[PDB]
Design a protein around this ligand. Structure first.
Ligand SMILES: *[C@@H]1O[C@H](CO)[C@@H](O[C@@H]2O[C@H](CO)[C@@H](O)[C@H](O)[C@H]2NC(C)=O)[C@H](O)[C@H]1NC(C)=O
Ligand SMILES: *[C@H]1O[C@H](CO)[C@@H](O)[C@H](O)[C@@H]1O
Length: 221
């Protein structure tokens, strides 16, 4: 189990819970047809009204830890339980106001993922564990400036040999992309993008040879 609960932007730490809608527990979302698949559920109140200014092309760290508290010292399952093999993914959606409570009917484009490397038997979850929960990626430099939600997701496939089984640990960050250009990428729906026929969601990790994470191709400028 794991929770995304803080951000670093171009090396500046914003603070625990700042500009992130932090779910109250580290319980997974398991229903890919639920609106809970968009940004999780049951947020710690009051929800942050910080919207992080991020230049297009800038480097962001989405911080995962075992619990919604963030870092509370040594813990063998911090940032996640290393037995929980699976991918890590990051998506953006353009939103009128990054503090708005309604997150339905947005168009999500994938900006980064780390799946599985067969030759080394290493999963994105392993890399995230090694990096102390630091999921690090860049914001595409060509994007239209404005308010966006940043959906960052860790999937455990330990029990994913049937659906339901995959465990989805995710949160949404609140950002304001500055600079940039005029590109407005095509996005997918949440719910909708993930289905029970996706081999990225139904997978036996003890029978895996090749692996493709669920959802659309990564967007690049
Ligand atoms: C993950 O990122 C964190 C947050 O940026 C890193 O911790 C910071 O490290 C710098 C320099 O080492 C310190 O000056 C900061 O005070 C740290 N931040 C906090 C909140 O304490 C951390 O090193 C990264 N972990 C890994 C393994 O890369
Ligand atoms: C943000 O910073 C990272 C370095 O941590 C760069 O690799 C990236 O190009 C962006 O400048």
């Amino acid at each position: 189990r794991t929770v995304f609960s803080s951000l670093t932007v171009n090396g500046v730490d914003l603070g625990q819970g700042v500009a992130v809608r932090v779910p109250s527990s580290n319980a997974p979302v398991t229903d890919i047809e639920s609106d809970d698949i968009i940004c999780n559920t049951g947020f710690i109140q009051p929800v942050s009204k910080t919207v992080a200014a991020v230049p297009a092309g800038g480097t962001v760290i989405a911080h995962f830890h075992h619990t919604s508290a963030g870092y509370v010292g040594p813990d063998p399952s911090d940032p996640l339980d290393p037995t929980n093999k699976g991918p890590v993914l990051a998506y953006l959606a353009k939103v009128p106001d990054a503090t708005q409570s309604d997150v339905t009917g947005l168009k999500w484009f994938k900006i980064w993922q780390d799946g599985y490397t067969p030759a080394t038997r290493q999963w994105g979850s392993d890399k995230l564990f090694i990096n102390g929960g630091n999921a690090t990626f860049t914001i595409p430099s060509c994007l239209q400036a404005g308010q966006y939600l940043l959906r960052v997701e860790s999937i455990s496939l330990l029990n994913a040999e049937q659906y339901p089984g995959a465990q989805f640990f995710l949160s949404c960050g609140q950002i304001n992309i500055t600079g940039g250009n005029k590109v407005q990428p095509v996005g997918v729906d949440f719910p909708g993008a993930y289905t029970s026929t996706d081999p990225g969601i139904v997978t036996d990790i003890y029978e895996v040879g090749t692996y493709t994470p669920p959802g659309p191709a990564v967007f690049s400028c």
